[model samples]
Target: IMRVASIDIGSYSVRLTIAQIKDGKLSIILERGRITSLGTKVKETGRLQEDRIEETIQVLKEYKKLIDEFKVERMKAVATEAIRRAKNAEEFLERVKREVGLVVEVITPEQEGRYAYLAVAYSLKPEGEVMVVDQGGGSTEYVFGKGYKVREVISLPIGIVNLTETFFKQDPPTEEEVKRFFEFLEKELSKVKKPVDTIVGLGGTITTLAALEYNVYPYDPQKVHGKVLTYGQIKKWFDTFKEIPSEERSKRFRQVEDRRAKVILAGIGIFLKTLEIFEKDCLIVSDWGLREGVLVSEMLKEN
Candidate 1:
C-alpha cells in the first residue's frame, strides 16, 4: 500500500488527509479540519491575515508530524479561492514553503473545478453529465461535465466568510440584507448556460446541511454522504435557520457548529439561490472534495 498526504487550504479552513491506497482504492487513515478565517477581509484589503497564516502554518506542522508518523510517501497541497485572489499570495506561499516545508500551488478556477469534478465523479460515479457546485469560504465553483471530461467551469467570488463579513449586520438577518445576496447569486449563476444531467453540492456547507437533515452529532460522513437535498428541504432548512439566532444554532440546529455556525444561514442562502438558477429542484450532496481529488490525482501520476 502507498501512503499519501493531501492538504487543502481554503479561505475558512485548513484540511489534512492521509490515506492508504491499493488497487486504485483509498482508505483514509487520518483526516482533520480546522476552521480558520485565513481569507478574512481579503476582498477589502487584498491580503491574507498574517495571524491566520501563522495559525494555519502551526496546523500544517501538526499534520506534518502525523504524516511522518504514518510514513507518508507523497504529500501535496492546493490553495483555493483565498490565495488565488490575494494580491500578496506569492509572498504568503513562499513563507509557507519556508516555514512549513510545504510546496503549494494556487490553482486556477477551472483547475479547482476539475479537481472537484474528479472527486465527485470518481467517488459517486454518477450516471451522466454532473454539475458540481463546490463552495468554500472565498468562492463557489461551478463545474459541468460528463464522465471524466469537464465541459465548463467558473468560480464565483462569493462565499461564507466574505459574505458574512459583508452582509451579516444583525442576528437573524433581515430580508433586505439576505435577499440582496440572493438576488446577486441568482443573477450571477444565470450566466451558466449549460445542460446538466444531475447536480452535486460539495464542500463544508453542503455536508453540514446533510448533517442537519439527519440531526447527526459529531458529524459522521457516512450519514452525510449520498444524501440528497431537494428544493423544499433547502427552503425549509433556510427558513428554519433564519428564525434561529446564531448562538442558539449549535444547540437547536443540530448542524450549526464551529465557524460555520456564524454563516450557516448565508451558506444555505447561496445553496438555494443556485438551485433556483439551475431551475432544478434537487441536488446530491457530496462529502468528497479537493483532498480526495488530490489523492486520486496523486495515484494516477504515480502510475
Candidate 2:
C-alpha cells in the first residue's frame, strides 16, 4: 500500500485529495475543498489578483501541513484556468514553491480532461462510450472516451466565474438576463455534437446538485457520487436559484456554500443548457474528479 496526495488549484476553488492505494485500488483518506476565487477578475484583468493569490498560498500552506501529517509518500499539484490565464502565472508558481515549498504546474485542458477520465474510468468503470464533463471555475473539460482510452477532449472557456460576472448583473438576474445566459450557453455548447452512451458530470456544481437532490447534509460523497440529476430536477433547482438572491441560497439549501451561492446560477445554467443540447434526461454525477484523477495518473505511472 502507498499513500499519496494531489491538489487541484482551480479558478473557483482549491481542492485536495489524500488517498491510500493497495492492490491497484484507491481509498480516500481525506478530501477538502476551499473556495478562494483565485481567478476572480482574471478574465477581465488578465492577471491574478494579489489578495486571491495570497489566499490561495495560505490554503496551500495548510494543505502542505496536512500532507506532512499524513506522511504522504508522493504528492502532485496542478493548477487550472486562473493560473493558466494569468500573466503572472510564473510568479505565482514561483512564490508557491518558495513559500509553501510545493511545486505546482499549470496543466493544459487536454491533460486536465485526461486525468479526470482516468479517475472516472478506473473507479466508476462504466461501460460503452462515455462523456465526462469536468467543469470548474474558469473552464469546462469535456472528454469522450471508451474505458481508459480518451477519444476527444474539449476544454471551453465558459467557466462559472466569468459567466456570472458577465451575465448576472442584478442581485438575482433579470428574466432577460437569464434568457441571454442560456442563449450564450447554447451557442458555446454547439461545438459538442457527438452522441454518447453515458454522460458523467463532474465539478463542485454537479456534486452539489446531487447532494441537493437527496437532501444530503454534511456533503457525503458516498451519497453524492453516481447519483443522477434529471432534466426536470436541474430545471427545478435552476428556477429556484434564479428566484432568490445569492445570499438566500445557502439558507435554503445547506448543501450550497456561501461563496458558491454567487456563481451557482451560472453553473446550473451550463448544466441545464448542456442537457438540452445533448437531449439527455439525466447525467451520472462523478464525485471523483481532477483531484483524485491526478493521483490515479500517479498510480498509473508507478505501474
- Give the runs in model 1 whose Cα sits over 4 Å from its true position: 34-58, 84-88, 98-100, 165-168
* Runs off by more than 4 Å, candidate 2: 11-14, 32-69, 95-101
The estimated TM-scores of all candidates read 0.87, 0.87
lDDT of 1: 0.82
The pairs that clash in candidate 1 are none
| Best-fitting candidate, scored by lDDT | 2
- Candidate 2 lDDT over 171-281, as tens digits, reads 799999888888898888987868988889999899998899889999887898888889999999998999999999988899999989999999988988888898889
Residue-level error in angstroms, candidate 2, position 259:
1.6
